[PDB]
Amino acid sequence: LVAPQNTFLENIVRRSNDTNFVLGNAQIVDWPIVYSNDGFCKLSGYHRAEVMQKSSACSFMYGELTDKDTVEKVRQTFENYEMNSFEILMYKKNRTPVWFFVKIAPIRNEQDKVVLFLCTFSDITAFKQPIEDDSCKGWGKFARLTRALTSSRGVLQQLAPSVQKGENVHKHSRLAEVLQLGSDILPQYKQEAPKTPPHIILHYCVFKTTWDWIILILTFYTAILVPYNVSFKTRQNNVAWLVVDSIVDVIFLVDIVLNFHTTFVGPAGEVISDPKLIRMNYLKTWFVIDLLSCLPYDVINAFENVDEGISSLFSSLKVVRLLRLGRVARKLDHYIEYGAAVLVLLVCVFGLAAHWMACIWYSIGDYEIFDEDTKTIRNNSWLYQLALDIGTPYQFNKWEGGPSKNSVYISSLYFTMTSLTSVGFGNIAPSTDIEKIFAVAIMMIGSLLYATIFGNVTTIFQQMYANTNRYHEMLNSVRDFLKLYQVPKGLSERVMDYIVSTWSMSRGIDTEKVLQICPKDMRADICVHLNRKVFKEHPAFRLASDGCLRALAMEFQTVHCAPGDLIYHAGESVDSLCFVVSGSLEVIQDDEVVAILGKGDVFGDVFWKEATLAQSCANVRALTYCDLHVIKRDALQKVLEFYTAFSHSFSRNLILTYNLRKRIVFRKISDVKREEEERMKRLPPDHPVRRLFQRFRQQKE
Amino acid sequence: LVAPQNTFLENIVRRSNDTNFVLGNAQIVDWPIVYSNDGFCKLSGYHRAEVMQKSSACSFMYGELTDKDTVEKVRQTFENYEMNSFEILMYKKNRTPVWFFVKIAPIRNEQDKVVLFLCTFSDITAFKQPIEDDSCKGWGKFARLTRALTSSRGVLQQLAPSVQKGENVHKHSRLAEVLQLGSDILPQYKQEAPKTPPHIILHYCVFKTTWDWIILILTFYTAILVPYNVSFKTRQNNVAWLVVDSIVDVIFLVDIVLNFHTTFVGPAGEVISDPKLIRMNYLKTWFVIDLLSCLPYDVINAFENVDEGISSLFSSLKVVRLLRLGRVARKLDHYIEYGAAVLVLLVCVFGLAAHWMACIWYSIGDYEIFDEDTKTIRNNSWLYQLALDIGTPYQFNKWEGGPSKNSVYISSLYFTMTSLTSVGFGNIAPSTDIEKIFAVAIMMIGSLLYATIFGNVTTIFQQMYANTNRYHEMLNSVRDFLKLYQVPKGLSERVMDYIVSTWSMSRGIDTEKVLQICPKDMRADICVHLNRKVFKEHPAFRLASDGCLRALAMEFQTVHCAPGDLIYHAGESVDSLCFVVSGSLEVIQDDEVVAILGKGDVFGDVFWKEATLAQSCANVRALTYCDLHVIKRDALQKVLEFYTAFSHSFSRNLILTYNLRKRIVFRKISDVKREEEERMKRLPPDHPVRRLFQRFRQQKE
């Protein structure tokens, strides 16, 4: 989410440290100036526009005291493209001769070419010999030159008055700030994305995504396992549990380390990648909590110490890595956001709450069943009830254990579960006060959890139906309109066929909306792409310029059509030129076929010549599914008159297939036979019709 | 929700009591008139427009009989800004000389300045000596003057014919209505919000809001506690319950008093704050109910009287303060309305209904268990069943009590609860007829309550997803369109990058919609703010007037762009001026870099000079993320020709960085070397090409 960016001006101005620079082209003869810094503009007194395009040699800066040897040296250093520095008198706009130190640095290109020359300048007037062509006084001229030397007199040499013979180090101090420009020359005219530090890996790499999926699976597995072991306090018989616990805790610590070594996205900035601040930000935000939550705290339980009862609660506290997950959810859900991702999040929280409240019901029962050394059986307890139900009742002499831990686990799970979805079988009763308060807490939280899933599942029916409903409402309105206004079957089915076909090919595409969203130049490129067919195939466009091509692409509109469609009916005013790129067309003149139109054909009229609109002499009808491109007369004329140069070539190259303004005369064989046989079968009062004949002859004259 | 308002005209006209007044400026020499009342307009006969801007001295009113002493007195009283009153003959528009009483009152300003002079006038003709320059008759002139004196003859002196020598009090009666104007002078030209009475406190103060939160918590606590004590009829063992009950009832009475002393909002008026009506409105609407509901009625139970069984039902009746809360809800919910406030309202009504129906189930059981002195155990009762289930069965000799009240409370709560959410454990059965009807009532109301929460929770998924769905549908349509029309990868990713970046930076912002919602002047201010950058930094605008600045701000449009974007391709018609405020730009001429554009640069053409559009000679492309401001030629020309004065300064100050109409010529070093080595390696039939050469020379001539 970043563009190949160029930063040369900002980089060079920031590296300059209040110095000045001038830029000029390398490959053009005499190397014209392409840029001048504001500092140079003010130092020379000449404006940027008047220094623009001038020669890099700065001959326009020269004066009588300039050195032909220096001129030759700058000339040959330009012609050989090496780094150098110089010292020479130069003339300001007031034609005051003043001293200058100069350095040159041509800049290479990413293509290993060399494109640019870079210049730097500095005053040394207050330190060189005094010179004055004309002055009010020698001391006054000295003071004025020293006050002009403020650039050197500033931070670059502010310590000078505390020392003597400072010129032994002032030259090097000035030269270092220009020698630093070698780093500025590095990008070599290239515009490119900035770099990021190593050992901090981009968060969006596929390897990091599968790492995120792995830590997902790990935290889900730990959230399963933890409440089980902590509730039942089972014996550590197989070392595998401790092995898995320690490895998964250390892999979580490594995950925290990679968050400490990975890119992060902030609300105030699209990408944040500086190690010097990302680590501290991650710390101060959430890294302290991550450290508080993700260590292998079970090592304390594995070891032995005087910390009686201190470290027990670590397991549920470290389950919370689901909260790291929830922070990641903002991104990770979007891989299934299409698909209602929250469905899995629901299922997971269901399972988690079920297991949690299973262990809670177990804990309450276990705490209640025996009344300590008082030996009160408390037969009212649910666990006693289930023990007697399943058999193997308790005994004493000593105590019998009755039910087994596995069966009792599933007992608790199943009660939690039935409470969760309100089926309430009722075989296992919450007899005691605290059992029965816990029943409050569980079924309340269950109902709140329960409402959400109905909302979630309803959230998809809009997608599943509303599009069809939009189609349905337009179709129903069309039906009512069409039937209400009594359109016969032919035109009615033509209308509905057009509606259904165009809707099938379109649906949700808003092509005009996409166009107007698109910015002007990309719009130009899109329409050029869409009219590429006619542009390449028709020879009239083989000569066009890119600008006129773009404008014509804006103007062009493409029409698909069904067979039997009538494009130009007789007597209609022709106003458009049109091309055929698919299908075929036919022309009807006086109910007679006179022309057929195929691929690549173009017909219309010479608008640029006639300049007057005319009626259509014939009818043109489709016989195939055809694609056509049409152009309006006025816009075509405007583009043509703007591009007069292309206009002449376009006029002389373009030839039409048929011209709608002209028409042909003909005779039918049947009509000729009728006339011949009528002649085979074959006036003084006709003076009025003869007068009409004479009038017609005069009009035709 | 009120603006700093001015009411001087309405206030003074209402205080005037049918008198007249005239206003004039204080700080302008000769004090021109700024306003004239309609009464004065009609009394003088001169129209408002012709009296406008005239001198406050009313010299244009004067006549031969006027007094130079009075003229000097009004002059010096104006020059010294004191209050005074006067009497003088003046002339009406018909040039009839008539008597006038006059009073003057300059008005101060909120800045302790003085800005305005106020005048008042009145006729005394019928009481002063008779005067007539020319008349039909003396008695007729007397009658006409008396009929002109109707202003004094009206309500100000209507009692005069019942008295004699009334002039001893008529002057004071007239003067009082003008002396009242001192209160009218109070606001001192200031426009400000009106005042509200003390001891009635604004309802929206933060202290009042936290008071509302406190009364919320109090009524919630009382609603918890009341059905418990009233159902179980527990002994009053700790005085703390009575203490809390009495303090909370009296704090509710104090709350009712503060509603009686606080602002209230009515549908017919945005703010209602008059004590003389707000108290009565609050009374007649709801204050009678508040008094009916909020007293410490438990004092009767604490005391002793012959009122056997009268005062018991007070507690549930005073719980209803949740209805005061519900009236407040219209406002109070909106602090959590963002956040689906109704969720807490649900949770609260849940808890309330649970506890209520707990106490109801308890009441039914307690009423049923024992069949009075008949000693029928009624073992069918649910409470008997639970007693035998838990143990400690009932006994007699005398009666054993069995279950304890705490356990029985939670029993009832828990049954109500399981009935509420239909889990229906079934261990506690409604055996008896009435138990079992109550089961009807509870589970019916439970299902009605239950449906609401699903609606509530579904109400959020639109917010959670529909925005993403809008983005999804446009992206899907773009994908289908782009792939269907076979755009290569380069342009395809350019398009999708533009779409996603613009959508990320925009989302729900409809900037154009905000603009068109905004009214014209604030639109002007917004665009001035947005173009402040160019306005302040570019010297050409340092001279502009506010009106032309506003119009140009309306015209300006800003464009952000990505690197590689081509603004003006070669051969395109230049029609816009444009400025650079961010990033950098580069210019390509004949595939050669010729110019670079930086911060603050401007390029285009001199439209106001050339007046003819021209094609672009070069190409300009972006290398950085850049922000630009563009101006259309036609609107710029129109604004300039309107503001001709600024036009000359703008033309003479403005200088372009590069002009698209002009172009540069150059040569390549490689091309020069090729030509030189070709010359190192180096016509009669050429007459046709020589003729072309001669034609070219003639055309260039």
Numbering used by the authors:
A (entry chain D), B (entry chain C): 10 to 406, 412 to 696, 704 to 722
Task: Give sentences copied directly from the paper behind this entry.
Here, we present a cryo-electron microscopy (cryo-EM) analysis of the mammalian Eag voltage-dependent K+ (Kv) channel in lipid membrane vesicles with a voltage generated across the membrane using K+ ion gradients in the presence of valinomycin. The Eag K+ channel was chosen for study because its pore is gated by both membrane voltage and intracellular Ca2+ through separate molecular mechanisms. Four voltage sensors inside the membrane regulate the gate in response to membrane voltage, while four calmodulin subunits in the cytoplasm regulate the gate by closing it in the presence of Ca2+ (18). Voltage-dependent ion channels contain structural domains called voltage sensors that control pore opening by membrane voltage.
The intermediate and down maps (no symmetry) arise from the class with a more heterogeneous voltage sensor and have overall resolutions of 4.9 Å and 5.4 Å, respectively. The intermediate and down maps are less well defined, no doubt due to conformational heterogeneity. In the intermediate map, the position of S4 is in between that in the up and down maps, the bend in S4 near the cytoplasmic surface is still apparent, and arginine density is visible below, inside, and above the gating-charge transfer center. These features constrain K1 and R2 to lie above F261, R3 to be in the gating-charge transfer center, and R4 and R5 to be positioned below the gating-charge transfer center, thus corresponding to the net movement of one arginine or one helical turn (∼5 Å). As expected, the pore is closed in the intermediate and down conformations.
